Design an enzyme around this catalytic site. Structure first.
Site, PDB file in Angstrom:
ATOM      1  CD  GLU A  50      -1.927   4.156   8.005  1.00  0.00           C
ATOM      2  OE1 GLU A  50      -1.556   4.574   9.153  1.00  0.00           O
ATOM      3  OE2 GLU A  50      -2.075   4.894   7.005  1.00  0.00           O
TER       4      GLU A  50
ATOM      5  CE1 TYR B 134      -2.302   3.763  12.541  1.00  0.00           C
ATOM      6  CE2 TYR B 134      -0.187   3.044  13.444  1.00  0.00           C
ATOM      7  CZ  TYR B 134      -0.951   3.422  12.377  1.00  0.00           C
ATOM      8  OH  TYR B 134      -0.397   3.567  11.164  1.00  0.00           O
TER       9      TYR B 134
ATOM     10  CG  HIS C 102      -1.415   8.785   3.059  1.00  0.00           C
ATOM     11  ND1 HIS C 102      -1.584   7.432   3.304  1.00  0.00           N
ATOM     12  CD2 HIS C 102      -1.058   9.332   4.254  1.00  0.00           C
ATOM     13  CE1 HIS C 102      -1.337   7.175   4.581  1.00  0.00           C
ATOM     14  NE2 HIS C 102      -1.000   8.309   5.173  1.00  0.00           N
TER      15      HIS C 102
ATOM     16  CG  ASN D 164      -5.477   3.338   8.723  1.00  0.00           C
ATOM     17  OD1 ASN D 164      -5.558   2.369   7.966  1.00  0.00           O
ATOM     18  ND2 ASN D 164      -5.104   4.518   8.309  1.00  0.00           N
TER      19      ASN D 164
ATOM     20  CD  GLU E 214      -5.440   7.708   9.431  1.00  0.00           C
ATOM     21  OE1 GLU E 214      -4.804   8.745   9.691  1.00  0.00           O
ATOM     22  OE2 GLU E 214      -5.257   6.665  10.105  1.00  0.00           O
TER      23      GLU E 214
ATOM     24  NE  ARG F  18      -3.340   2.579   2.588  1.00  0.00           N
ATOM     25  CZ  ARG F  18      -3.358   3.455   3.578  1.00  0.00           C
ATOM     26  NH1 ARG F  18      -2.838   3.139   4.739  1.00  0.00           N
ATOM     27  NH2 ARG F  18      -3.937   4.623   3.381  1.00  0.00           N
TER      28      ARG F  18
HETATM   29  C1  LIG Z   1      -4.854  11.761  21.448  1.00  0.00           C
HETATM   30  C2  LIG Z   1      -4.506  10.328  21.086  1.00  0.00           C
HETATM   31  C3  LIG Z   1      -4.801  10.105  19.612  1.00  0.00           C
HETATM   32  C4  LIG Z   1      -4.028   8.874  19.128  1.00  0.00           C
HETATM   33  C5  LIG Z   1      -3.485   9.123  17.726  1.00  0.00           C
HETATM   34  C6  LIG Z   1      -3.266   7.793  17.003  1.00  0.00           C
HETATM   35  C7  LIG Z   1      -2.776   8.101  15.585  1.00  0.00           C
HETATM   36  C8  LIG Z   1      -2.504   6.814  14.826  1.00  0.00           C
HETATM   37  N1  LIG Z   1      -2.270   7.064  13.383  1.00  0.00           N
HETATM   38  C9  LIG Z   1      -1.078   6.936  12.759  1.00  0.00           C
HETATM   39  S1  LIG Z   1       0.351   6.450  13.645  1.00  0.00           S
HETATM   40  C10 LIG Z   1       1.406   6.921  12.293  1.00  0.00           C
HETATM   41  C11 LIG Z   1       0.545   6.913  11.017  1.00  0.00           C
HETATM   42  C12 LIG Z   1       0.976   7.888   9.913  1.00  0.00           C
HETATM   43  O1  LIG Z   1       2.369   7.654   9.640  1.00  0.00           O
HETATM   44  C13 LIG Z   1       0.106   7.604   8.696  1.00  0.00           C
HETATM   45  O2  LIG Z   1       0.442   8.428   7.595  1.00  0.00           O
HETATM   46  C14 LIG Z   1      -1.345   7.993   8.985  1.00  0.00           C
HETATM   47  O3  LIG Z   1      -2.203   7.381   8.005  1.00  0.00           O
HETATM   48  C15 LIG Z   1      -1.842   7.533  10.364  1.00  0.00           C
HETATM   49  O4  LIG Z   1      -2.726   8.541  10.905  1.00  0.00           O
HETATM   50  N2  LIG Z   1      -0.866   7.197  11.383  1.00  0.00           N
END
Ligand SMILES: CCCCCCCC/N=C1\SC[C@@H]2[C@@H](O)[C@H](O)[C@@H](O)[C@H](O)N12
Length: 443
Positions: free
Chosen positions: A349, A293, A119, A291, A164, A75
């Site tokens: 992701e 995390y 992106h 995605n 996103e 991707r």
């Molecule tokens: C206040 C707490 C919020 C938590 C934030 C979690 C963000 C997780 N997202 C990530 S962690 C790192 C990645 C980015 O590198 C990628 O380009 C994006 O698509 C993506 O948004 N991304």
């Protein structure tokens, strides 16, 4: 042992501005991330995407790493202003050449391309005209998408409109932490709406141009849990899910309107006849990309705007301070099925940043990242056993890269990059994942 379905797609993921460098090479126009990161104060350490991983020059080596690892899908995203330097109009042939070589190489090596159309690197020329705040961006975006579908749709059959859109709108135009760095709630909600319109128009163009292909869209998501059993904490979670997760976009796409709680909260900021566009927004999509995390504990808070605050928990965290909650990926997958029943889903992701160290052996012993990926992959497998149509899983990211406002300080790769020499060093998580792909699952 946790074996995945036959044909399951294991991938890795990057984005154009985070890895390419050479933003202005070969007639490219500037992007809003070039101008944003060149503005003092916006990015940690004054980092920019001027060089990044130098993937503009090293793309073949980086694809050879994907190949060596046995990874089956890649991707990646395409820089809009490399293709159309003024946003619309004249097509830059050398921009098309760059991604063509990538696409052809991937196919030669049996790696399936998943192309993200947008992106976050909007052409600067279009930001001068309002960018996502301007209704006309649905036309601009459809045009750009057409150029990509015509030039690459013979070879590329798996497409993503937007990465996103919640982040593009809210982080880029309300929090002002991302390009174009605005803090205006009315602009932010017009962005949300225009992203939906642009997405749907690109899918419409895709039906005319690439008849045997699939198209989808990617959402950020967190796993929100209530701080207590009080009804107001439970309502806070419901708000956070509807606003910050897939329903903000999927309720329009599948049900023809924004989520109840989002309308309740944000009707003031949306264009008054927004619902007139809902018919077209419902253009059929082939898959949803999620995605994921982190997880968050949420409470109703009368002092907070939005009336919601996060509560820190005693849980393991990444180098970002994000709580590691693997069952969140199971919940978000079960829930997208329960709520919208999309025909196919991908995890587009999942990954983590940790304080990576190159040891004396010239290796990176990132057990912390292995443990992170392992736990999430296991939970995704569980979602599949319970009938979620999860078709593939993509690690963010193949390479350490420019982490937006964090710059190079935060490393997400399964491959370490020494920015001084541009040397790539496959991390232990990289080798571990290679084995996951070989085994088609966890052993
Ligand atoms: C206040 C707490 C919020 C938590 C934030 C979690 C963000 C997780 N997202 C990530 S962690 C790192 C990645 C980015 O590198 C990628 O380009 C994006 O698509 C993506 O948004 N991304």
């Amino acid at each position: 042992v946790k074996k995945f379905p036959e044909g399951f797609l294991w991938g890795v993921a990057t984005a154009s501005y985070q890895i390419e460098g050479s933003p202005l090479a070969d007639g490219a126009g500037m992007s809003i991330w070039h101008t944003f990161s060149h503005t003092p104060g916006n990015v940690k350490n004054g980092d920019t995407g001027d060089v990044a991983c130098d993937h503009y020059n090293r793309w073949k080596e980086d694809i050879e790493i994907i190949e060596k690892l046995g990874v089956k899908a890649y991707r990646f995203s395409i820089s809009w202003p490399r293709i159309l330097p003024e946003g619309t109009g004249r097509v830059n042939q050398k921009g098309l050449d760059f991604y063509n070589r990538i696409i052809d190489t991937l196919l030669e090596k049996g790696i399936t391309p998943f192309v993200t159309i947008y992106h976050w690197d909007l052409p600067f020329a279009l930001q001068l005209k309002g960018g996502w705040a301007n209704r006309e961006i649905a036309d601009w975006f459809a045009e750009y998408s057409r150029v990509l579908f015509e030039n690459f749709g013979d070879r590329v059959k798996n497409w993503i409109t937007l990465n996103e859109p919640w982040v593009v709108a809210i982080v880029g135009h309300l929090y002002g932490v991302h390009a174009p760095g605005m803090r205006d709630i009315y602009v932010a909600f017009r962005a949300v709406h225009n992203l939906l319109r642009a997405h749907a128009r690109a899918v419409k163009v895709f039906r005319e141009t690439v008849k045997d292909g699939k198209i989808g869209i990617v959402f950020n998501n967190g796993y929100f849990e209530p701080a207590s059993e009080k009804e107001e904490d439970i309502r806070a979670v419901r708000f956070m899910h509807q606003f910050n997760n897939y329903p903000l976009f999927l309720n329009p796409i599948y049900r023809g309107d924004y989520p109840e709680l989002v309308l309740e909260f944000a009707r003031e900021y949306l264009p008054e006849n927004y619902k007139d566009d809902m018919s077209e927004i419902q253009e059929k999509i082939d898959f949803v990309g999620l995605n994921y995390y982190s997880g968050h504990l949420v409470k109703f808070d009368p002092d907070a705007p939005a009336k919601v605050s996060f509560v820190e928990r005693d849980l393991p965290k990444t180098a970002m301070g994000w709580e590691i909650v693997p069952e969140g990926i199971y919940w978000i997958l079960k829930k997208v099925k329960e709520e919208y029943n999309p025909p196919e889903v991908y995890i587009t992701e999942n990954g983590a940043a940790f304080d990576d160290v190159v040891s004396e052996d010239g290796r990176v012993h990132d057990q912390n990242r292995i443990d992170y990926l392992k736990a999430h992959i296991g939970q995704a497998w569980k979602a599949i056993q319970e009938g979620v149509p999860l078709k593939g899983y993509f690690v963010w990211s193949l390479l350490d890269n420019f982490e937006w406002a964090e710059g190079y300080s935060k490393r997400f790769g399964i491959v370490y990059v020494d920015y001084s020499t541009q040397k790539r060093i496959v991390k232990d998580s990289g080798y571990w994942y290679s084995n996951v792909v070989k085994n088609n699952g966890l052993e």
